[PDB]
Amino acid sequence: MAHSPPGHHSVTGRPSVNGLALAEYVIYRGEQAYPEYLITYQIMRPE
Amino acid sequence: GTILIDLSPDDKEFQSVEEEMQSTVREHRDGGHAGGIFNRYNILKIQKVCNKKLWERYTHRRKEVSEENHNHANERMLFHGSPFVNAIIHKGFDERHAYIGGMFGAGIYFAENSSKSNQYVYGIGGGTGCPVHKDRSCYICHRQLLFCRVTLGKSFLQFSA
Ligand SMILES: O=c1cc(-c2ccccc2)oc2ccccc12
Ligand SMILES: [Zn+2]
């Protein structure tokens, strides 16, 4: 696993072409995330 | 040490988690290749993941980040999709769950768009799709996402196409 950039705790991927995309994030330590909810689902075929 | 508690569809906590799932769906530049063609989900179950050791692991690190950032954990709720969800909920996140080839290096990736994390549920680029039909757009097979508490602390901003 890599390291956070010096002086930072994570990286934010700010969307820069697709105006509708939300942000994505990266942490380099597993202890910086807790999996609160397990969601079970199906994607639905559009009508 | 992990137990899974079901939330009733009537519990406002179920309802707010569902709403974040559904409202953060978007169209993807791949036309649905990785994650399938859909505008919304059918939610079958939402479970609270409880593990005291993993939680204390999380909050210990949270206080360290916080103390390095004027008492600001910069905590978010974000989605994660992975073939390793079952190992994650039992043993916690670690290096085996990292995206070695990710655009921001080998770390653990999270999304505000649920539909983004959906693209990783069957692997990188959707892998070969569902186990049963080999269908990246399977409408039948049950999928699982995690909705995660993530400490971002001081985050390096990357502008990115
Ligand atoms: O939810 C996400 C999950 C993954 C992922 C990548 C490799 C191995 C396991 C999971 O990648 C992403 C990349 C961008 C945004 C979100 C995600
Ligand atoms: Zn299937």
Q: Tokens 């993941």, residue?
A: B49
Identity (one letter) of the amino acid at B126? Answer: G
Method: X-ray
Residue A33's nearest CA partner among B8, B91, B126, B21 is B91
* Angstrom distance (rounded) from CA A5 to CA A3: 6
Dig out the tokens for B89 from the structure: 């909920």
A26 burial level (CB within 10 Å; 0-12, 13-18, 19+): buried
* Angstrom distance (rounded) from CA B130 to CA B27: 20
Structural resolution in Å: 2.2
The parent domain of residue A10 ranges over: 1-47
Dig out the tokens for B102 from the structure: 């990710």
Alpha helices in A1-47 (DSSP H): none
For strand B75-80 and strand A10-15, is the pairing parallel, antiparallel, or unpaired? Answer: unpaired
Binding-site residue positions of B = 130, 133, 138, 141
User: Does residue B117's CB lie within 6 angstroms of at least one atom of ligand 1?
Assistant: yes
- Choose which residue among B82, B112, B113 to substitute to test ligand 1 binding: the one with the highest number of ligand atoms within 8 A of its C-beta: B82
* Angstrom distance (rounded) from CA B110 to CA B104: 12
For strand B41-50 and strand A33-43, is the pairing parallel, antiparallel, or unpaired? Answer: antiparallel
Phi and psi angles of residue B51, each rounded to the nearest 5 degrees, phi first: -145, 110
Residue whose CA lies nearest to ligand 1 atom number 13: B109
> Which residues of B7-132 form beta strands (DSSP E)?
41-50, 75-80, 108-111
Partners of residue B155 in chain A, C-beta under 8 Å: 8-12, 25
Distance B10 CA to ligand 1 centre (A): 30
Please state the domain count of chain A. 1
Does the beta-carbon distance from B143 to A41 stay under 8 Å? yes
* Angstrom distance (rounded) from CA B62 to CA B66: 6
For strand B155-160 and strand A10-15, is the pairing parallel, antiparallel, or unpaired? Answer: parallel
Domains of chain B: 1-161 (3.90.228.10)
| Strands of the B3-6 sheet, one edge to the other | B3-6, B41-50, A33-43, B143-151, B75-80, B108-111, A24-27, A10-15, B155-160
Distance B90 CA to ligand 1 centre (A): 19
